Amino acid sequence: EGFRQVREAHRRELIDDYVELISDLIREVGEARQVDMAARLGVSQPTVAKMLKRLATMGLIEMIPWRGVFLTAEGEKLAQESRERHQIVENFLLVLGVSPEIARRDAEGMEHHVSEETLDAFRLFTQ
């Protein structure tokens, strides 16, 4: 599998993606169902169900019968913070002059590998 540090960083990125996904789903279609999450992640339903229980254990999500998944106050803030980091990187790349599509693409995959000091540096760039 791998070094503890790397697995822990990978777990963190998964958590962020899951809570951002849930918020985006509620915001776009009004609900976040397990089947829709699975389809939008590209994974089976069993693995989504598996991650949801981990999230509940971390007090990040609440599951309601016939209504799907929702975020808790802690989970919604976590999603807001991830989104914010992705935006800082995206805006930085836009200031650099990268096409809007590519800027948004790279920012999504890059953010999780950007240290805090680097993100600050990106933010710094006002121009």
Residues of this chain that interact with its own copies (CB under 8 A) are 1-3, 6, 41-43, 93, 96-99, 102-103, 105-106, 109-110, 113-115, 117-118, 121, 125
Between 29 and 39, whose beta carbon lies closer to its own copies?
39
- Minimum distance of its own copies from residue 62's CB (angstroms): 26
Distances (CA, A) of 70 to 73, 92, 106, 123: 10, 31, 28, 31
- Minimum distance of its own copies from residue 69's CB (angstroms): 20
Between 65 and 97, whose beta carbon lies closer to its own copies?
97
Between 61 and 90, whose beta carbon lies closer to its own copies?
90
- Minimum distance of its own copies from residue 55's CB (angstroms): 19
- How buried is residue 86: exposed, middle or buried, by Cβ count under 10 Å (0-12/13-18/19+)? buried
Distances (CA, A) of 72 to 17, 32, 41, 76, 80: 15, 14, 21, 6, 12
Neighbours of 79 (CB within 10 A): 22
Between 3 and 66, whose beta carbon lies closer to its own copies?
3
